[PDB]
Amino acid sequence: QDSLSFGFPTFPSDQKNLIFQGDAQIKNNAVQLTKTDSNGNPVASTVGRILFSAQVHLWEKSSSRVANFQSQFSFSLKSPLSNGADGIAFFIAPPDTTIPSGSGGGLLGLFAPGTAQNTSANQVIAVEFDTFYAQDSNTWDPNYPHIGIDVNSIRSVKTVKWDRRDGQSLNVLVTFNPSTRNLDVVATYSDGTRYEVSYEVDVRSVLPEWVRVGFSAASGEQYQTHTLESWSFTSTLLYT
Amino acid sequence: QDSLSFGFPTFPSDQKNLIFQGDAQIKNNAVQLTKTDSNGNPVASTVGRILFSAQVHLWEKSSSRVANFQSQFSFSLKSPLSNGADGIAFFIAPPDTTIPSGSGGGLLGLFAPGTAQNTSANQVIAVEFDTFYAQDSNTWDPNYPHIGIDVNSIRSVKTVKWDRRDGQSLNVLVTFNPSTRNLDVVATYSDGTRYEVSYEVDVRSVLPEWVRVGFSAASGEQYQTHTLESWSFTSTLLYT
Ligand SMILES: OC[C@H]1O[C@H](OC[C@H]2O[C@H](OC[C@H]3O[C@H](O)[C@@H](O)[C@@H](O)[C@@H]3O)[C@@H](O)[C@@H](O[C@H]3O[C@H](CO)[C@@H](O)[C@H](O)[C@@H]3O)[C@@H]2O)[C@@H](O)[C@@H](O)[C@@H]1O
Ligand SMILES: OC[C@H]1O[C@H](O[C@@H]2[C@H](O)[C@@H](O)O[C@H](CO)[C@H]2O)[C@@H](O)[C@@H](O)[C@@H]1O
Ligand SMILES: [Ca+2]
Ligand SMILES: [Ca+2]
Ligand SMILES: [Mn+2]
Ligand SMILES: [Mn+2]
């Protein structure tokens, strides 16, 4: 299809169009990307991702068209500690993507240790909400919590300082305009606190014509829940 | 997802989200549901169907909601014979639906001979454009080409007279309003000739909560191409 849109205001237990990977599962009408124990507390060493099952036609070589797309979602992070880890990311990747070996912790379930910073070895565009940045293990991160745009590497091409608020939902709008090639991110807390980051990227040189979209989250030694509460997506192929 | 929409203004060869069954295949940017030889001419004894891969959430028991959906599509039929057969149908069925054994010809690839008129034996809602009505073989049909609404049986719950026009595209809009439970069908030719038929049906009593949508066509001893040219579909769950 030239156009595709879907909306999940909540996530009831009987899902048919979601591919669950790792520890991801539905609980209490939300997707819990990382593992929790019996009483709902986050645990260490867990990775989980979900992808929508239908493939998205991102660009078409024969017609020279590229899709405009918009992804809106909300999530909350909760943790007994004050330095919860590691973060959640919205990502776009080839359809057959699976959790890479050793991609836990700061690699967010998106990159393999050996090639995490090698741009020629990956095919992924992700918008990360990164809460852990200790320089001994997350050497690629700025030294503060941040939202970052990742293009084939865990070392973001662009970041903005961000504030983690335990238990508060963050509403996010991610938009890609093929006319300007701008991937824009706007995130807001309910009190109006806003964060914005953008980057120019030609999606045609990074990803294949057909892709899958989804979310990934991980916790290494430090942990927190990564609860995806709602998600809507729309894509339309346009001539530019 | 509570809402899902997709649009195929045309059908390029590179498809990823269509399930092809039987002889259906893409040719010349359209879906040819029934088999054609090398020269693009129709042949006898063929059946084909396509289904969109993502499942549609038609109704939800736990929330007392039912979907409002609209399906817009265009198709054309062509045959050198004076009695081209058998017809094309838009249908909604359980996700695991497959072509029933012996469902060729007048059964349109939707029903098995033994239970074709047994309503308690099927789960399908279909809108048929039926061009073959010989009273000796298609005993359930009215004696003229017609548009029919089929609910668990090849003997339509209702039909309206229709004119088959060789090689001319018919544009069709099928809508279902959960508030009134009306399934409405409006079809038009390019000169403005219009056909309309409506039926009240509680989809919750006929189909499961999650379904797949698609098209089916067949040719028995007489034949014609059944070419699906474009298709858009949208569905959203609403409180009733
Ligand atoms: O795709 C159309 C139709 O094909 C299959 O039905 C076959 C055949 O059934 C009826 O006649 C049976 C036999 O008739 C003769 O003995 C031979 O031609 C033999 O080969 C046939 O099998 C009949 O309905 C027939 O339709 C033709 O004849 C009728 C009546 O003379 C006429 O009104 C029609 O326009 C046509 O010429 C039909 O081909 C099955 O697969 C059906 O489900 C399917 O609808
Ligand atoms: O989840 C945080 C972090 O855990 C793991 O690394 C550890 C941390 O850097 C911190 O606890 O110090 C430890 C000792 O040096 C170190 O092992 C990894 O999974 C890492 O990727 C993750 O960010
Ligand atoms: Ca980090
Ligand atoms: Ca018939
Ligand atoms: Mn980071
Ligand atoms: Mn009929």
Instruction: Give all domains of chain A, ordered by start, each with its CATH number.
Output: 2-240 (2.60.120.200)
CA B19 to chain centroid:
15
Determine, for residues B5 and A5 on separate chains, whether the beta-carbon distance falls below 8 Å.
Answer: yes
DSSP letters, chain A, are --EEEEEESS--S--SSEEEEET-EEETTEEE-S-B-TTS-B-SSEEEEEEESSPEE-EETTTTEEEEEEEEEEEEEE-SSSS---EEEEEEE-TT--PPTT--GGGTTT--GGGTT-GGG---EEEEEE----TTT-TTS-SS-EEEEEESSSS-SEEEE----TT--EEEEEEEETTTTEEEEEEE-TT--EEEEEEE--GGGTS-SEEEEEEEEEESSS--EEEEEEEEEEEEEEE-
Q: Could you say which of B16, B53, B55 has the minimum Cβ distance to residue A210? A: B16
List CB contacts (< 8 A) between A2 and chain B. Answer: 7-9
Q: How far does the CA of residue A73 sit from the closest CA of chain B (Å)?
A: 13
Sole residue written with tokens 């060493």: A45
User: Is A45 a pocket residue for ligand 2 (Cβ < 6 Å)?
Assistant: no
Q: How far is the CA of B143 from the centre of ligand 4 (A)?
A: 9
List CB contacts (< 8 A) between A62 and chain B. Answer: 12
Q: How far apart are CA A139 and CA A125, in angstroms?
A: 20
- When scoring B8, B11, B16, B238 by the number of chain A Cβ atoms within 10 A, the one with the most, hence best to mutate, is B16
Put residue B95 in one of left, alpha, beta given phi > 0 → left and psi -120 to 50 → alpha.
Answer: alpha
Number of residues written out for chain A: 240
Determine, for residues A55 and B17 on separate chains, whether the beta-carbon distance falls below 8 Å.
Answer: yes
Provide the sign of the torsion angle of the four alpha carbons A141, A144, A145, A150, taken in this order. Answer: negative
Environment class of residue A12 by beta-carbon count within 10 Å: exposed (0-12), middle (13-18) or buried (19+)? middle
Sole residue written with tokens 């990747």: A93
Q: How far is the CA of A10 from the centre of ligand 3 (A)?
A: 28
> B130 among the known binding-site residues?
yes
Let me know: does A238 contact A178? Beta carbons within 8 Å. yes
Annotated resolution, angstroms: 1.8
Amino acid at position A5, single letter: S
Ligand 1 atom closest to the Cα of residue B85 is: 1
Q: Which of B94, B6, B187, B131 is nearest to A234 (CA)?
A: B6
Q: How far apart are CA A106 and CA A83, in angstroms?
A: 13
Q: Output Rg (C-alpha) for chain B, integer angstroms.
A: 17
Let me know: does B51 contact B97? Beta carbons within 8 Å. yes
Give phi and psi for B131, each to the nearest 5: -105, -5
User: Is B214 a pocket residue for ligand 1 (Cβ < 6 Å)?
Assistant: no
The ligand that comes nearest to the alpha carbon of residue A85 is: 2
Determine, for residues B1 and A8 on separate chains, whether the beta-carbon distance falls below 8 Å.
Answer: yes
CB-side exposure of B74: number of CA atoms within 13 Å? 16
Give the per-residue SS3 of chain B.
CCEEEEEECCCCCCCCCEEEEECCEEECCEEECCCECCCCCECCCEEEEEEECCCEECEEHHHCEEEEEEEEEEEEEECCCCCCCCEEEEEEECCCCCCCCCCCHHHCCCCCHHHCCCHHHCCCEEEEEECCCCCCCCCCCCCCCEEEEEECCCCCCEEEECCCCCCCCEEEEEEEECCCCEEEEEEECCCCCEEEEEEECCHHHCCCCEEEEEEEEEECCCCCEEEEEEEEEEEEEEEC
What protein residues have CB closer than 5 angstroms to ion ligand 5?
A 130, 141, 148
User: Is B222 a pocket residue for ligand 1 (Cβ < 6 Å)?
Assistant: yes
Burial code (b: 16+ CB inside 10 Å, e: under 16) for A21-31 equals bbbbbbeeebb
Provide the sign of the torsion angle of the four alpha carbons B233, B237, B238, B240, taken in this order. Answer: positive
CA B119 to chain centroid:
18
Amino acid at position A179, single letter: S
Q: How far is the CA of A224 from the centre of ligand 6 (A)?
A: 59
Q: How far does the CA of residue B55 sit from the closest CA of chain A (Å)?
A: 7
| Residues within 8 A of A (CB atoms), B 59-88 only | 60, 62
CA A39 to chain centroid:
26
Q: Which of B82, B132, B83, B84 is nearest to B107 (CA)?
A: B132
Q: Which of B117, B75, B67 is nearest to B92 (CA)?
A: B67
Beta-carbon contacts of A44 under 8 Å, excluding residues fewer than 6 positions away, are A219, A220, A221, A222, A223
Cα angle vertex A28, ends A22, A29, to 5°?
Answer: 85
Q: How far is the CA of A141 from the centre of ligand 3 (A)?
A: 6
User: Is B132 a pocket residue for ligand 1 (Cβ < 6 Å)?
Assistant: yes
Give phi and psi for B72, each to the nearest 5: -115, 135
Q: Both tokens of residue B13?
A: 């060869």
A–B: how many Cβ contacts below 8 A?
58
CB-CB neighbours of B185 under 10 Å = 21
Beta-carbon contacts of A7 under 8 Å, excluding residues fewer than 6 positions away, are A231, A232, A233, B1, B2, B3, B4, B236
Q: How far apart are CA A132 and CA A217, in angstroms?
A: 12
Q: Both tokens of residue A109?
A: 């379930």
B176 CB within 8 Å of a chain A CB = no
State which approach was used to obtain the coordinates.
X-ray
B210 CB within 8 Å of a chain A CB = yes
Ligand 2 atom closest to the Cα of residue A137 is: 9
